[PDB]
UniProtKB/Swiss-Prot annotation, chain B:
<feature type="transmembrane region" description="Helical">
    <location>
        <begin position="256"/>
        <end position="276"/>
    </location>
</feature>
<dbReference type="GO" id="GO:0045271">
    <property type="term" value="C:respiratory chain complex I"/>
</dbReference>
<keyword id="KW-1278">Translocase</keyword>
<feature type="transmembrane region" description="Helical">
    <location>
        <begin position="21"/>
        <end position="41"/>
    </location>
</feature>
<feature type="transmembrane region" description="Helical">
    <location>
        <begin position="350"/>
        <end position="370"/>
    </location>
</feature>
<protein>
    <recommendedName>
        <fullName>NADH-ubiquinone oxidoreductase chain 4</fullName>
        <ecNumber>7.1.1.2</ecNumber>
    </recommendedName>
</protein>
<feature type="transmembrane region" description="Helical">
    <location>
        <begin position="146"/>
        <end position="166"/>
    </location>
</feature>
<comment type="similarity">
    <text>Belongs to the complex I subunit 4 family.</text>
</comment>
<dbReference type="GO" id="GO:0009060">
    <property type="term" value="P:aerobic respiration"/>
</dbReference>
Swiss-Prot record, chain C:
<keyword id="KW-0472">Membrane</keyword>
<comment type="subunit">
    <text>Core subunit of respiratory chain NADH dehydrogenase (Complex I) which is composed of 45 different subunits.</text>
</comment>
<keyword id="KW-0249">Electron transport</keyword>
<dbReference type="GO" id="GO:0045271">
    <property type="term" value="C:respiratory chain complex I"/>
</dbReference>
<dbReference type="InterPro" id="IPR010934">
    <property type="entry name" value="NADH_DH_su5_C"/>
</dbReference>
<feature type="transmembrane region" description="Helical">
    <location>
        <begin position="478"/>
        <end position="498"/>
    </location>
</feature>
<comment type="function">
    <text>Core subunit of the mitochondrial membrane respiratory chain NADH dehydrogenase (Complex I) which catalyzes electron transfer from NADH through the respiratory chain, using ubiquinone as an electron acceptor. Essential for the catalytic activity and assembly of complex I.</text>
</comment>
<dbReference type="GO" id="GO:0015990">
    <property type="term" value="P:electron transport coupled proton transport"/>
</dbReference>
<keyword id="KW-0999">Mitochondrion inner membrane</keyword>
Amino acid sequence: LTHQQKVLRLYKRALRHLESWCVHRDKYRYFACLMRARFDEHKNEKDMVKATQLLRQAEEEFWYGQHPQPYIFPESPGGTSYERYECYKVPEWCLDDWHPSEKAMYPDYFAKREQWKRLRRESWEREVKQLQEETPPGGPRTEALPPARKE
Amino acid sequence: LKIIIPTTMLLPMTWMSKHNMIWINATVHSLLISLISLSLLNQLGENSLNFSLTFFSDSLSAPLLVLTTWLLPLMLMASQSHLSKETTTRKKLYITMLILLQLFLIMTFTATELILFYILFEATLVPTLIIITRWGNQTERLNAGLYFLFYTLAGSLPLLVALVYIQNTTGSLNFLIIHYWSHPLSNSWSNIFMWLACIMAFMVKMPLYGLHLWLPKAHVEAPIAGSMVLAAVLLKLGGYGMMRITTILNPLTNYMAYPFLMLSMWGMIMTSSICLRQTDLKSLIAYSSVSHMALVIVAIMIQTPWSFMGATALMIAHGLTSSMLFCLANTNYERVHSRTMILARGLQTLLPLMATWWLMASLTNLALPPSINLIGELFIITASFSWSNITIILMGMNMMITALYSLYMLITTQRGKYTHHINNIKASFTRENALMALHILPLLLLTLNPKMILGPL
Amino acid sequence: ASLTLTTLIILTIPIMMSNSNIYKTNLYPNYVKTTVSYAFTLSLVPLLMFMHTGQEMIISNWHWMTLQTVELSLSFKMDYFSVMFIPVALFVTWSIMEFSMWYMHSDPFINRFFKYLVLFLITMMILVTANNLFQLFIGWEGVGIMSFLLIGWWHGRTDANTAALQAILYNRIGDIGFVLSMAWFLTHSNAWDLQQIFMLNNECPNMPLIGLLLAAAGKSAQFGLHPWLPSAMEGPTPVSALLHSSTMVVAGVFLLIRFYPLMETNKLVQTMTLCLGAITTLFTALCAITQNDIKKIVAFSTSSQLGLMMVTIGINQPHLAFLHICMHAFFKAMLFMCSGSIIHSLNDEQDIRKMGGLYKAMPFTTTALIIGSLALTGMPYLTGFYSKDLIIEAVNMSYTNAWALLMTLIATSLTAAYSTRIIFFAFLGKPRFPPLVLINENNPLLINSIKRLLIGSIFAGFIISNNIPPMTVPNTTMPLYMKMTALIVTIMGFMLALELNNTTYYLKFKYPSQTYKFSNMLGYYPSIMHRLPTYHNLSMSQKSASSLLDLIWLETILPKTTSFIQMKMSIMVSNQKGLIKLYFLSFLITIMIS
Amino acid sequence: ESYRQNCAKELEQFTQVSKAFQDRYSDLGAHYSARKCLAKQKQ
Amino acid sequence: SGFYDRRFLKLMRFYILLTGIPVAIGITLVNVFI
Amino acid sequence: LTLEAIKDRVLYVLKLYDKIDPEKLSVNSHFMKDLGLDSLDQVEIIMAMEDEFGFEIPDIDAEKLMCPQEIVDYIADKKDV
């Protein structure tokens, strides 16, 4: 992690809890503008060693005011429905099991599907060689760019 | 003697059966002989039923006998896909272990001489040993064999000498007359060692909390056909015998019950607590089994008639439900070879009907009305409560934890996300559903007519 | 006789139809709503034969298992309670049917959902009707497990599962007490039947009543056992409306209602019942003042109502205590369903703070929620009045502990409080839900549902208070402020809560006081009673029991012992060597000894 | 709603009956047997 | 795939009822007459 | 929902932000090298923009953001349109 993104996430965070308090769009707008006004009016530019101390201040000042429970959108890990639908998301390979009396009933979809599976089984060695190629001994980074096919 | 001959007769039939048809032979005829076993159930409301000089059929034995006859086909249905690549002679050798085993059971339930009952009681030990040791998976099974073995013998052997002693200090060793000629033995010190000598073997074979260590380590290892018997039956037979020999003893039981009532009343809550945090399912079930057997053993020792009624009922119900959970776990173990419960994850998502069986099975494990499990348990809580008003505070905690872990095994190995890469699962065979439907249906019909399962008292 | 048993048994048939292909059809559920409809139509009749002539009945068609002395048998007593209660359940549940057809209309497995509905209701019928105590236990526990199946409906997210497990856990803790009592009546009274037990127990029962009380605390979510109920809102709304509003949780006190005379035998029972029911009203209502979910607020409300009626039992007035339920169901089902309309309308956003101000956007739901809130509030001739006023008044004029009465007062204030909170944020403000507005009140079945419950919600108080025989024998004298108090406390509620709420509207950021953090952390209670004992146990069950107690000592003490001793002995006797002079000389000395 | 009436009448005969039946067949325990009921009656 | 389960139920229901009908009817005929 | 609806609603929110001058706005218009808005306002535009949908933005993905096309692409992925 790095300092800039850090202070930023503190900002989005604090701002959100700040809505959670202010409820009304009005008051929230006002205090929001006041808040960003605080971040700039303070040290929008400074040496680092002071700045980290300013964060250590800010974290406390936030933690005291953080509100017993923020608003959370349902998709988010809090959620009123963080995984309501995980009952349903069946992995594709499972259909590949239906046996012909079922498989006959969707000739089209299955056709297109073997097209895909073919595409993969054909493709795979290339991702092998490429992954083998672009990689050093093996650093922090995940994935690597396409260059001529598949990726 | 009529039910017992054909049970012998399947063996020639097995050996002479065509090499790829044997499963059908053994299955069909085992079912038939089950139905013949069922006619025994009639009993009588007064006198214990009698037969030859050498057999009799107390009401206490009959439901057990029916059960024991009933299990063979089940073990066959479970086994017959677990093994396939095995050579024909070896397979044909294999079912012989099972049937030979139940033959010893049909003999050892109807008794009648307690020395005959003993020698069969201990004779059961061999085939189950062979099965645990040759067809169990992974290394530990070897070691497991030993724990299963000596704990029985170290218990059984003194019982043996004790038996011989009595038929010398009194007339016959036979059960009926000893039920009638019974006379109290009392305090001293010789009589106390007589007491433990006539109890410890039975209290080993149904595990007691201080001694149960072999049992989980048997169930971890045994191929499922060994598991179903080792759980559903042998424990219960140890209980049957202990209910038998209590015709003697008294009044001394009043004075000697206490230590074992402490190991049991505490061991139930304890083992159930351990049960709440297993790494792998196949053990979880086993500790659930001990956690229920403790109830049987106090139910026997408080010796109140309610307690024996509840004893019988709970023995049978726990039989069926435990066997059911075992096969029902082996299915997962075959589909993914995980054994560890954590890997199964979202198994419900990928297939439904098994989730239904998980539901029914666990649901009757926790015992809710009017499962014969429950009603079996409530009586012994009643008599226990009569025996000591405090005792309820212990029983209640059991009924807490047996909820939790039971539901737990459900919600951890089912509800939740599928693991992604585990492609191995393949959509439920007919025999699977057939099998567990075969466990659970009798268990539910049986509630309609308890009066034939409560037993002699 | 044939009538009541039919008004039960027909409910069973659709489940039977569950294996029939019609179940696999989309067509199934409407046969269920129609089924409950006919069930209700049939259900009215016994109540009327019960009316003008007043007869009551018990039947026990078939003994199930004849023990010595005891012979338990299923037995449907059909007293005042059991007859009066059924039409209510059929009514509200029928409305829930019609609601659910729309709430879930997208959802797969919906048919299974209805199957679980009927399967629940039938167990509830098992509980309300049963005479023989054991049958009451099957109704009990079975209702518990249906609660488990429905709470976990969205089984994917873990939180649903924890909620379900939590509910079964606290119910079970109640079940311990239930079993204690259930044994004790058999050991002593030798019974398991209300005839037997009512007959033989003129003497004071010092203890069974308290364990039975704990069981009553189980379902009813008293203070020691409240949290599962708030967490039970996590299941999909029509479920929580179904039974956490009414049909389930009220049964927990219904049990205690059934056994009034024995309570009357003791003083300490009425005592402690009051002692706790009051404080649970208060302690719940406080958390109810300050939440943000619609449904959590409504949940704390329903539990608070339960505490109130619980002192209504504890004040030794069982009849009104039952009377309050019958009113309560309509109110709460109203609230959860209108709330369901809001939530479905907006793509499901429970949180009020970004709930819009939509007083005009959904006017009919508005009306509904208004009459509902007024009913729960206890307005003078509206349905909630005929319970609440008679209740708290009777508490006033009764001899009793006063501090609890005080608690009833603050509680009935807070009723008005949160009830105004939800109105305020739900409607009044300029709207603040995210832009696009998919809002669509329209879909006729929903309309019809809310309509019927409004109808009951306004007439039933008067009609039922009129028709019932005067078991109450009224207290109507001194003084005048006696009757006024129920109103003025409400008025204080609206004035304080509303002026406060408007003061929230005036800029000026502040930071929370400790009381806010307290009452909005649900009393801290879940966050301490869950993160603590469970830790000490799950640790203990490994730090000790699983490990050193039974994997490392219990095995050391007798396998590893002997197994070691034979190592030593066996290496000692078979000493490998074999030099002659050794053992040969040993032959010598063994002869000298011999 | 009355009782404490004719029910007191039955309650009495039940009191006598259950009394004596309690007496004849109490702490016999499991494996109740006539020899034991005798052994109690002499007591 | 839901085929295997529904097949299982078709079978099981078919047999339990296969023997189921003659028995139930036999019990009824025995009820009305003898 | 459709891709045009996404790009349209997104710009329709970017237009209302004061610091952007609406004529200069373009789907491909860059966010720092073009327009001086800086991150402290970037956080505002992103949270305010997700808020329109009720959709939630994970932080590490919030770090990229920049080009509005990259945004419409992002919601296109998460909603799977």
